[PDB]
XYZ file of C-alpha atoms in Angstrom:
591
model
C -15.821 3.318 23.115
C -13.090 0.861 22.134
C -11.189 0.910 19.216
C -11.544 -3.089 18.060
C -15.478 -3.620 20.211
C -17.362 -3.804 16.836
C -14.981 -6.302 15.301
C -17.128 -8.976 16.955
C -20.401 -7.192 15.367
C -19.402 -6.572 11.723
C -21.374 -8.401 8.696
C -19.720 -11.507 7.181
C -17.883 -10.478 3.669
C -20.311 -11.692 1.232
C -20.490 -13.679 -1.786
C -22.305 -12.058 -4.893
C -25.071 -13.574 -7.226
C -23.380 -15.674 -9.959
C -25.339 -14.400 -12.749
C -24.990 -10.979 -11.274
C -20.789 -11.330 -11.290
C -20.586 -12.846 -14.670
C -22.612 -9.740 -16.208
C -20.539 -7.380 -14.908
C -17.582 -9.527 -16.591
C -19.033 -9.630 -19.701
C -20.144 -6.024 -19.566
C -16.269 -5.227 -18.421
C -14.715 -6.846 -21.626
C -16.379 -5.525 -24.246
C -13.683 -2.405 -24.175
C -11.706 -4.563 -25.846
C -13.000 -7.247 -27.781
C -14.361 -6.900 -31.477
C -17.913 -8.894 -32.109
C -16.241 -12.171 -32.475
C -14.113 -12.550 -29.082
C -17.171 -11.358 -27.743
C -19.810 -13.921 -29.270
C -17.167 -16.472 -27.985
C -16.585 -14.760 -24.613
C -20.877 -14.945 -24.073
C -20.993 -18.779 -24.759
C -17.612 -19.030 -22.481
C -19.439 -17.447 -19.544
C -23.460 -18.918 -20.235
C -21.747 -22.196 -20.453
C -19.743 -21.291 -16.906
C -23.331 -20.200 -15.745
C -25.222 -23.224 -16.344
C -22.390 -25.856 -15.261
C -19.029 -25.627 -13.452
C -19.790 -22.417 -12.487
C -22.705 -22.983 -10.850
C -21.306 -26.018 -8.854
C -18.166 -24.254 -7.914
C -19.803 -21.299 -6.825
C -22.373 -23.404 -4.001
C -19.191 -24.648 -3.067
C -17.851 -21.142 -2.371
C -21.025 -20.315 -0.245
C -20.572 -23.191 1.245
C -17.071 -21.901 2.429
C -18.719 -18.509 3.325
C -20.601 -20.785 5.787
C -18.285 -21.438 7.736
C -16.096 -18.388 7.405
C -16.664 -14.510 8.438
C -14.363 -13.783 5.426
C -14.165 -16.421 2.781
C -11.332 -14.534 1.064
C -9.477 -13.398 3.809
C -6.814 -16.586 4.020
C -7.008 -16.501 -0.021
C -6.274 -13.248 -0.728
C -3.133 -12.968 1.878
C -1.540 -16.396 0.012
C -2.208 -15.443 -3.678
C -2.155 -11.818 -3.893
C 1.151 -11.735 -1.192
C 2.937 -14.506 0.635
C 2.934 -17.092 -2.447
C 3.885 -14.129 -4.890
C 8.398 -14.669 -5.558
C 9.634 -11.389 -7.142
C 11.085 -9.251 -4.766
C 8.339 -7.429 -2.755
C 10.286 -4.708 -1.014
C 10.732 -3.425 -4.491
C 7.880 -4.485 -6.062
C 4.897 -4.973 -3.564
C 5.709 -2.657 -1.005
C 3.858 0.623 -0.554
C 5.337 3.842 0.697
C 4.798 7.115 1.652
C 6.728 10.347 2.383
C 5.892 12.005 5.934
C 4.256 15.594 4.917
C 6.239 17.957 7.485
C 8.470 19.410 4.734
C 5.133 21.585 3.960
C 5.232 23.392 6.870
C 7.745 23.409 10.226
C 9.901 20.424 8.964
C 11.228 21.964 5.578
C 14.168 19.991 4.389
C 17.735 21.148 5.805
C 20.513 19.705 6.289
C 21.728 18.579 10.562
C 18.197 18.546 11.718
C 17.843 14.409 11.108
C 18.442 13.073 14.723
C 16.548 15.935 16.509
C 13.165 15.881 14.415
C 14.123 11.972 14.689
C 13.435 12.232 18.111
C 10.074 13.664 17.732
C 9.029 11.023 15.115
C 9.787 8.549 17.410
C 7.485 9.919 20.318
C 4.948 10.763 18.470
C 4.725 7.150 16.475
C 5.332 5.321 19.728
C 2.504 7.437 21.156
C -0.052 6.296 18.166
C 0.938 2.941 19.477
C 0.018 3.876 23.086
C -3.420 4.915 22.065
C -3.602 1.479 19.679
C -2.676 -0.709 22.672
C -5.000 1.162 24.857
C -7.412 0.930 22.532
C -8.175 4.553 22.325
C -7.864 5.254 18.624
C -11.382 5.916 17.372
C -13.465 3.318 15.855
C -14.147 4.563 11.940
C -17.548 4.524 10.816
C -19.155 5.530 7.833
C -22.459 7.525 9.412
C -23.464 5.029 12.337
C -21.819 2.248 10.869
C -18.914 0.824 11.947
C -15.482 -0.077 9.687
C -13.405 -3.010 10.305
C -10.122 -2.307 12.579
C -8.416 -5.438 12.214
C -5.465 -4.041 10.121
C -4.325 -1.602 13.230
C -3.010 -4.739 14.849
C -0.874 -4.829 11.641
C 0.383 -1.720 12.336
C 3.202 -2.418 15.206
C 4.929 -5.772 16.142
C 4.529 -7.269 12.980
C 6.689 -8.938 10.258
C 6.935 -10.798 7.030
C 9.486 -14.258 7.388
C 10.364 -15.885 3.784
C 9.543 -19.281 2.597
C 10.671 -21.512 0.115
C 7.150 -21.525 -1.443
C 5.064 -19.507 1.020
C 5.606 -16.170 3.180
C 4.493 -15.993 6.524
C 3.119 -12.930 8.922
C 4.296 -12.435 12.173
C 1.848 -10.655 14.130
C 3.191 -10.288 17.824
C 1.019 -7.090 18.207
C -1.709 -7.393 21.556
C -3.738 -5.052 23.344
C -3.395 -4.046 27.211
C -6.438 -6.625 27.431
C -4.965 -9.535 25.604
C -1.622 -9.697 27.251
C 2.218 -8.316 26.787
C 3.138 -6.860 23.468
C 6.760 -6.207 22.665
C 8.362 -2.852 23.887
C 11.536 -2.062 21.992
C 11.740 -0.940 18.819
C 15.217 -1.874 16.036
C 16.944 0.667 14.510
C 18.947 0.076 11.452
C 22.309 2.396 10.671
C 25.426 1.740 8.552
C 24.616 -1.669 7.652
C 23.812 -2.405 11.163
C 21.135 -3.198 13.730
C 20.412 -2.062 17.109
C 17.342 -2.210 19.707
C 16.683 -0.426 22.719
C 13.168 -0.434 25.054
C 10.633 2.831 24.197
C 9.200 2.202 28.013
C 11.194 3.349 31.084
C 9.830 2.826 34.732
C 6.192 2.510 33.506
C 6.182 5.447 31.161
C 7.359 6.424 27.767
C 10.631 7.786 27.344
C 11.039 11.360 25.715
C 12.150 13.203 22.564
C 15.288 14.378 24.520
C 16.326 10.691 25.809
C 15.186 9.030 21.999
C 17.643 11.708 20.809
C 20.471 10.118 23.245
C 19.719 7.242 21.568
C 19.740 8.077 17.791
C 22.514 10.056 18.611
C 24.633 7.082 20.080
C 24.001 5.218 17.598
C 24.727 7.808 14.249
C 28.141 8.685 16.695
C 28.885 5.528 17.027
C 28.476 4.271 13.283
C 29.538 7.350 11.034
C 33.088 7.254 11.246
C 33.104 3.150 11.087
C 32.692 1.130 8.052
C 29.328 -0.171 6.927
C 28.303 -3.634 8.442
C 27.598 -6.959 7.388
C 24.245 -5.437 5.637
C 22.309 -8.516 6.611
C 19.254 -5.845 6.177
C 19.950 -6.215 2.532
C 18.536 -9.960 1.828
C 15.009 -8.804 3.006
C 14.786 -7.330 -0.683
C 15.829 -10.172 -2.628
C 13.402 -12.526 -4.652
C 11.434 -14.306 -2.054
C 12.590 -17.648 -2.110
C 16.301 -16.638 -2.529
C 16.056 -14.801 0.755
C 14.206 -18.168 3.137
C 17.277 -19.927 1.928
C 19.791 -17.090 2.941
C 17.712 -16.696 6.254
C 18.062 -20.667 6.817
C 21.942 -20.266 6.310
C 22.185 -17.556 8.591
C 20.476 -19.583 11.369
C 22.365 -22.076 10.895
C 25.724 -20.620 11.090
C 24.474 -19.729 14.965
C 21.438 -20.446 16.717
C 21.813 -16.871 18.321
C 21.001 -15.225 14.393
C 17.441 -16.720 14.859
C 17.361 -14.545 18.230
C 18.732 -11.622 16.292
C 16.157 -11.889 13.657
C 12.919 -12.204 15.773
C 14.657 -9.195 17.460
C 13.678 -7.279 14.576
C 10.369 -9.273 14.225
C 8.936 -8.432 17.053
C 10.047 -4.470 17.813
C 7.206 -2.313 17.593
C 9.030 -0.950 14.211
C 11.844 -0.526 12.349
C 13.369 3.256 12.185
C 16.162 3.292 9.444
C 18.619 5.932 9.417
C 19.936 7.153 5.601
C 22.897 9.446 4.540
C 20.556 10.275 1.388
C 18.973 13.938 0.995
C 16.080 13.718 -1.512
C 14.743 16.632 -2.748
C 11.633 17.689 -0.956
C 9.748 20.799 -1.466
C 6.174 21.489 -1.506
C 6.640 22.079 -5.343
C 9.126 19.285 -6.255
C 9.561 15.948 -3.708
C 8.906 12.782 -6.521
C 12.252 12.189 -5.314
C 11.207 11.306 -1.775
C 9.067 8.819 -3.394
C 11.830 7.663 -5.577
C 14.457 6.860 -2.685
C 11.817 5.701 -0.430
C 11.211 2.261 -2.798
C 15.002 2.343 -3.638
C 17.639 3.767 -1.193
C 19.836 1.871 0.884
C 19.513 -2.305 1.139
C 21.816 -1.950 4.296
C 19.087 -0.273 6.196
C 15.654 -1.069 4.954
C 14.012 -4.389 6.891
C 11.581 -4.863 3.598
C 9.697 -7.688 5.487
C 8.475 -4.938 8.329
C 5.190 -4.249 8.259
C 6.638 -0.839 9.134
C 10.069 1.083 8.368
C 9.821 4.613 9.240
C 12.827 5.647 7.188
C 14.771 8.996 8.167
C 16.848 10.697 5.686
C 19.895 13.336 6.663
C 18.156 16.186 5.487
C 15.117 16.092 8.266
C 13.225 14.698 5.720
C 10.977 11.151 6.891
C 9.174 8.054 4.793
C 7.009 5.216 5.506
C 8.040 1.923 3.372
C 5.316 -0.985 4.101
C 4.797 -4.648 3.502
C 1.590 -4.738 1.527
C 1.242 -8.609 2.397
C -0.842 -7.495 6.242
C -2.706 -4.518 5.279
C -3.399 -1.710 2.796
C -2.174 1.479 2.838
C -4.725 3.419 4.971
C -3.273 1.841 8.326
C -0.115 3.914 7.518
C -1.908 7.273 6.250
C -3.785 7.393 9.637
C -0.907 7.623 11.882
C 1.251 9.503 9.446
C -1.699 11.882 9.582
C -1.926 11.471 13.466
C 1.916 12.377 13.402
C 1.420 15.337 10.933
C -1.121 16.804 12.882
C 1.073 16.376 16.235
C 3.990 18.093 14.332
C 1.639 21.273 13.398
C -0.021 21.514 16.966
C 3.741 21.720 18.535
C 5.417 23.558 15.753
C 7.292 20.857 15.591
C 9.169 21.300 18.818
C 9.253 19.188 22.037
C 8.401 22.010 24.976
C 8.785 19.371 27.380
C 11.406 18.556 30.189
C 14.863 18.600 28.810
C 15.376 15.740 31.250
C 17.444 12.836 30.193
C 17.376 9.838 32.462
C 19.357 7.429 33.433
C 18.279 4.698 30.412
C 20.143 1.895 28.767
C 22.155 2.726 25.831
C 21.328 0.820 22.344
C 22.157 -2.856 22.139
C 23.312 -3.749 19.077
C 22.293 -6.949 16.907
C 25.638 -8.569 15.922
C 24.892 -11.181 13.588
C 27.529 -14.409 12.972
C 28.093 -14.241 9.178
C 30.966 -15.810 6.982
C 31.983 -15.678 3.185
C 28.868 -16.945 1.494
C 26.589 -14.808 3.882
C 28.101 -11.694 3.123
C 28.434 -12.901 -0.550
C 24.656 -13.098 -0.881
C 24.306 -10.014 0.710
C 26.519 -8.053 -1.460
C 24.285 -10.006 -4.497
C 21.052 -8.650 -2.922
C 22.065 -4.884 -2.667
C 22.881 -5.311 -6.023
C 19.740 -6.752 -7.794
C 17.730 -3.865 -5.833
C 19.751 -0.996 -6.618
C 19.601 -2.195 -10.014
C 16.153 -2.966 -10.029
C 15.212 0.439 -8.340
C 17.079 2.515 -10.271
C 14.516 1.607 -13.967
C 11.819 3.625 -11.571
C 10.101 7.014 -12.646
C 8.332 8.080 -10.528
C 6.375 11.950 -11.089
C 4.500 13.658 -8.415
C 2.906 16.506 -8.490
C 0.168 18.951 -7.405
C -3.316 20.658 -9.202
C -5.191 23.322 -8.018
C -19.433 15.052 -9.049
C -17.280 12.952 -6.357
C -13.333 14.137 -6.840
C -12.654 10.013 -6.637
C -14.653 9.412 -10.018
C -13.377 12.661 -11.353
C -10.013 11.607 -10.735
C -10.533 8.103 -12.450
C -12.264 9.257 -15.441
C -9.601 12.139 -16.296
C -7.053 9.402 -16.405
C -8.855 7.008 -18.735
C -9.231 10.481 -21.018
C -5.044 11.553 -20.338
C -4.434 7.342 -21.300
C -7.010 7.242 -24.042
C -5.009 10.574 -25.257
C -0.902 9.658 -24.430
C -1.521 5.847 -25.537
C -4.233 5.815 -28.243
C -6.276 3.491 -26.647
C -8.693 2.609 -23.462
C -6.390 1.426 -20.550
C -7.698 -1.401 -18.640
C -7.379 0.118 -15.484
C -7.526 -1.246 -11.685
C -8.583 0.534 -8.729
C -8.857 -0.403 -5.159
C -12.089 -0.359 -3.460
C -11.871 -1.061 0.240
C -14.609 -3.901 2.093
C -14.148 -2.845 5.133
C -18.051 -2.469 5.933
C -17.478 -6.284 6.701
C -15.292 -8.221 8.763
C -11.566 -8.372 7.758
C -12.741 -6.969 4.874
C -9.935 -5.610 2.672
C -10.418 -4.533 -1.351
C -12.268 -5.404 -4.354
C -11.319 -4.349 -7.880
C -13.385 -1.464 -9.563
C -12.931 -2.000 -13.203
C -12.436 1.984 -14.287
C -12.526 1.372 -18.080
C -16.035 1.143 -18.869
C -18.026 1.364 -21.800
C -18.964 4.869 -20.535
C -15.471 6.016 -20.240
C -14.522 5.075 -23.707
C -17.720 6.174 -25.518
C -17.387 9.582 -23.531
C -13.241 9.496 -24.302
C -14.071 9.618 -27.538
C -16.473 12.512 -27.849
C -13.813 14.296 -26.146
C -11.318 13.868 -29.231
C -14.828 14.219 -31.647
C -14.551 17.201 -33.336
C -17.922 17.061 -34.060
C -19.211 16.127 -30.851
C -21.145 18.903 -29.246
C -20.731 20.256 -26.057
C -23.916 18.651 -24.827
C -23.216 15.460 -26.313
C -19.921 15.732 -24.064
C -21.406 16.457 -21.167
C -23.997 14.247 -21.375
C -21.667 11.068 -21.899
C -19.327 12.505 -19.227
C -22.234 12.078 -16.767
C -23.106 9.316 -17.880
C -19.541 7.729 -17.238
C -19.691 9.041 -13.763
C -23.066 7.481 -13.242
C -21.734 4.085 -14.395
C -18.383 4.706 -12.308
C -19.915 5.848 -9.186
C -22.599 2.143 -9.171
C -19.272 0.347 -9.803
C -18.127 2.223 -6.545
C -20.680 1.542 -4.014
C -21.693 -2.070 -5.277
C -17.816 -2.899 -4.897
C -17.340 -1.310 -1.796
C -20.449 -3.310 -0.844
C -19.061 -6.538 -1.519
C -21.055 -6.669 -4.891
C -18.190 -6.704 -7.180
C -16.908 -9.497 -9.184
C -13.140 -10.029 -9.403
C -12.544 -11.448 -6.294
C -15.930 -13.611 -6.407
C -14.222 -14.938 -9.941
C -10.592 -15.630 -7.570
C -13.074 -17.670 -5.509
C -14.365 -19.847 -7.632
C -10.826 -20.267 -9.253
C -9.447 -21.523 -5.773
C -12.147 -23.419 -5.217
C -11.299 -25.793 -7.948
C -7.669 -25.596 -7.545
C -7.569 -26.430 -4.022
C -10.069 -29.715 -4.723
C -7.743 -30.849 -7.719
C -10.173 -29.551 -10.717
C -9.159 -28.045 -13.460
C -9.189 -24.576 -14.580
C -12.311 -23.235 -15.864
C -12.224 -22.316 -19.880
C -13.671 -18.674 -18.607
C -9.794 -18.255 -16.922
C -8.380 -19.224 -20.058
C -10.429 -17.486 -22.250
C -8.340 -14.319 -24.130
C -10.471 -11.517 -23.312
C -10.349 -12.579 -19.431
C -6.315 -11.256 -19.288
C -6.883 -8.652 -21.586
C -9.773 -7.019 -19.505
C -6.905 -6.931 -16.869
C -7.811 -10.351 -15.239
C -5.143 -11.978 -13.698
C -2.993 -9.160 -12.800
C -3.172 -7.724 -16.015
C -4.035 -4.048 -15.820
C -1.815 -1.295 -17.603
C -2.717 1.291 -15.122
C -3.193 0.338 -11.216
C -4.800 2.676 -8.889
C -5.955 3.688 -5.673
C -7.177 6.861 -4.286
C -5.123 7.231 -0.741
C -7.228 8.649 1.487
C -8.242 12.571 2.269
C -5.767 13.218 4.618
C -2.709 14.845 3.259
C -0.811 11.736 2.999
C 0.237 10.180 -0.510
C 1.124 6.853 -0.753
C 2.560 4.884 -3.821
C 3.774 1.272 -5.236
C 5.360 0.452 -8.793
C 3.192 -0.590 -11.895
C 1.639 -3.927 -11.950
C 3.037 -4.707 -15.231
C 6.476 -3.663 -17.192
C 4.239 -1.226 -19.952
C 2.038 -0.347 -17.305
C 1.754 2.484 -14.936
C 0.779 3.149 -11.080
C -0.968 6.037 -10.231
C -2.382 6.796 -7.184
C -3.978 10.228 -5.188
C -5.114 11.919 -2.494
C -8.063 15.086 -2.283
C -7.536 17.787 -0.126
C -10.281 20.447 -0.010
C -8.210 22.951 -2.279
C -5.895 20.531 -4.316
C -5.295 16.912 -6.133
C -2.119 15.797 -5.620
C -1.128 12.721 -7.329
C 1.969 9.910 -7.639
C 3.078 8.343 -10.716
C 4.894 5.717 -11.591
C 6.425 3.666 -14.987
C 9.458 2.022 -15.247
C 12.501 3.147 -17.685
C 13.260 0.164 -19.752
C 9.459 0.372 -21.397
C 9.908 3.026 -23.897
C 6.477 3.606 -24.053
C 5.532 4.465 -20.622
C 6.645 7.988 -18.768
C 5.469 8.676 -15.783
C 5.878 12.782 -16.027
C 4.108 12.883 -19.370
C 0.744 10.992 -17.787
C 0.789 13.666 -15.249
C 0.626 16.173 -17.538
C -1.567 14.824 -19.632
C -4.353 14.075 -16.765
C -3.722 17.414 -15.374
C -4.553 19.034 -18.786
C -7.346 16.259 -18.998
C -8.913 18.137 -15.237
C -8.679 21.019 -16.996
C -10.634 20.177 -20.144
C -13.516 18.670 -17.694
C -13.410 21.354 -15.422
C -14.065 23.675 -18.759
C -16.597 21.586 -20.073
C -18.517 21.550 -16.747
C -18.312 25.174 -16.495
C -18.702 26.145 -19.941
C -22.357 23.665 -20.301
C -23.055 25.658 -16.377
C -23.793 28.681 -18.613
């Protein structure tokens, strides 16, 4: 079995029933709208049903026609490339490597050596990727899409002055030649060297020559020209920096596909966050901030490595979500346990080429902009919270509905919440939005804070909510949701010149959350040990986002500073108390 042979097999992403999506949106805003939005809200969308609607949505099957994924092309523009705020703050996604839990506990001199190890055991994911040897998920019998793998190595972002581009250089033994060298960024400086060496893949010991020429050589020099630095500017500032750099030399457009096209970027920080299997929010923290001078935000993947052995993934969201990265942070995790993390291989060093490093021609204005985009991140990064921490009926739903209650309780109200539900049953299938703040939810939020409400009653309404949740689930998952079926029919009018639809303009459709608009954005990240986090979606909103082991919950939160009203560490205690309170409940009814 090959890893990408069902690609060619999988069902075409589908397009729901009309009628079916706009019930679910009516059904979605009624959280939040008193009888008279909603009266006007009903005529919006019956009016939507019966005319534009109706013609804009034949159009969209008529798209699906012709196209395996009608949202595919869509989704990458609006959701990523056409977006401007910075996105290595902002959109990125990252997660901290989970070794500190067991042979890799933080300490200080062991960077370049377990370095060396991450390195081999990443480039040997790619191995099995190229090879196509990685095992084809499947849910039962039935096989997941593997298309965002190829996002995975060998890819990159490039700014425009309107629209972002991906650069995806990655190829399988059977399609052709894929690149072979990987960029390392130190100091405010690049370098690139090639992983392969005869036919074969070079080893911890030799990687460590090379990390270690290239800390050496960069430690006791000042910092470079940082050029690193504009790939976290707003997006449209940094195409016009890029197009100055190229034009000061031809050879910087070289230098910059350099980094394109290397199987990854490693960056190498002088930071120690604090990382313990008790405390490590910090990790998380200095893994969306950190150094400018060595983060390439546009990668697809930076594997950062901090001084005090302690490693992070920091990804472009733009090519693919963040189960690409959990999978071979896993695959590395599990390498790292199986070895104790030790090489107890041949201490053998050949004969390889040292580093190259990418000197880039810069002048005033170059290094001016450079020294403005540190700044704007460090400034913007340093208004994150971000809490993390540990507790010990699908857990997924669980999860969800304790944080409408700890939200309902901390805020006073039903958050409109947002969580990801992958597509991948079909081809190139990505996410749909699962709209956790249901009816359910709030009715069963507020027998919780009844103090009249029996236990029953509580119960009873808590089931119910998971019911409603778990429906919500499967039909999204299925390609049966609505909010990206409402994005199509949007686009379809946009990109023939027609106006916007009253339904888009319609209050209740941006307070529901439409249009980016949700207070708490969330994603469960997988079960394997992995934890993976992105700032809120909106100033006075929050991110949270978790992963289920089979003994624990462990959860990332964030909120940012300058909105009073938001704190990350007091939702996480509130949802944790919230778990408790359910798991009483459930209990207590047991009897």
């Amino acid at each position: 079995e090959r890893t990408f042979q069902y690609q060619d097999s999988l069902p075409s992403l589908p397009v729901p029933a009309l009628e079916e999506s706009l019930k679910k949106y009516l059904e979605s805003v009624k959280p939040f709208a008193n009888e008279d939005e909603y009266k006007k809200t009903e005529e919006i969308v019956q009016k939507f049903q019966e005319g534009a609607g109706k013609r804009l949505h034949q159009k969209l099957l008529e798209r699906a026609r012709g196209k395996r994924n009608w949202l595919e092309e869509w989704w990458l523009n609006v959701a990523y490339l056409d977006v401007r705020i910075p996105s290595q703050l902002n959109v990125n996604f990252v997660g901290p490597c989970p070794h500190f839990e067991h042979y890799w506990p933080a300490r200080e001199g062991t960077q370049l050596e377990r370095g060396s190890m991450m390195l081999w055991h990443n480039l040997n994911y790619w191995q099995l990727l190229r090879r196509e040897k990685l095992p084809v998920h499947k849910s039962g019998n039935t096989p997941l899409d593997m298309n965002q793998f190829r996002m995975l190595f060998s890819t990159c972002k490039v700014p425009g002055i309107t629209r972002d581009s991906i650069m995806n250089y990655f190829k399988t033994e059977s399609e052709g030649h894929c690149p072979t060298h990987i960029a390392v960024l130190c100091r405010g400086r690049a370098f690139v060297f090639d992983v392969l060496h005869e036919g074969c893949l070079i080893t911890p010991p030799e990687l460590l020559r090379q990390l270690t020429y290239i800390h050496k050589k960069c430690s006791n020099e000042p910092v470079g020209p940082s050029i690193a630095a504009l790939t976290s500017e707003e997006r449209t500032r940094w195409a016009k920096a890029r197009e100055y750099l190229i034009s000061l030399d031809p050879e910087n457009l070289t230098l910059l596909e350099k980094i394109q096209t290397s199987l990854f970027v490693y960056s190498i920080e002088d930071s120690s966050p604090h990382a313990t299997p008790e405390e490590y929010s910090q990790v998380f923290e200095m893994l969306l901030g950190g150094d400018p001078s060595v983060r390439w935000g546009d990668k697809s993947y930076n594997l950062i490595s901090f001084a005090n052995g302690i490693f992070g993934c920091c990804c472009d969201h733009a090519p693919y979500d963040a189960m690409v990265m959990v999978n071979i942070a896993h695959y590395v995790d599990e390498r790292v346990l199986e070895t104790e993390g030790r090489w107890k291989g041949s201490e053998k060093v050949r004969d390889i080429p040292l580093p190259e490093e990418l000197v880039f021609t810069v002048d005033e204005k170059i290094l001016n902009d450079v020294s403005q985009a540190k700044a704007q991140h460090l400034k913007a990064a340093s208004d994150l919270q971000i809490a993390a921490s540990t507790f010990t009926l699908h857990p997924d739903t669980f999860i969800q509905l304790a944080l409408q209650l700890a939200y309902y309780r901390l805020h006073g109200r039903p958050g409109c919440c947002y969580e990801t539900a992958m597509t991948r049953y079909f081809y190139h299938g990505r996410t749909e939005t699962v709209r956790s703040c249901t009816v359910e939810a709030v009715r069963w939020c507020q027998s919780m804070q009844d103090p009249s409400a029996s236990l029953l009653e509580r119960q009873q309404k808590m089931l119910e909510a998971f019911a409603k949740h778990n429906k919500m689930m499967k039909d999204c998952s299925h390609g049966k949701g609505f909010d990206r079926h409402l994005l199509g029919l949007l686009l379809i009018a946009k990109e023939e010149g027609l106006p916007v639809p009253e339904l888009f303009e319609d209050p209740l459709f941006s307070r529901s959350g439409g249009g980016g608009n949700f207070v708490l954005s969330t994603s469960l990240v997988g079960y394997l040990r992995v934890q993976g986090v992105v700032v809120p979606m909106v100033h006075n909103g929050y991110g949270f986002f978790y992963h289920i082991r089979d003994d624990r919950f462990v959860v990332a939160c964030s909120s940012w500073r300058s909105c009073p009203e938001t704190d990350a560490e007091k939702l996480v205690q509130m949802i944790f108390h919230a778990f408790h309170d359910m798991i009483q409940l459930m209990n207590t009814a047991h009897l």
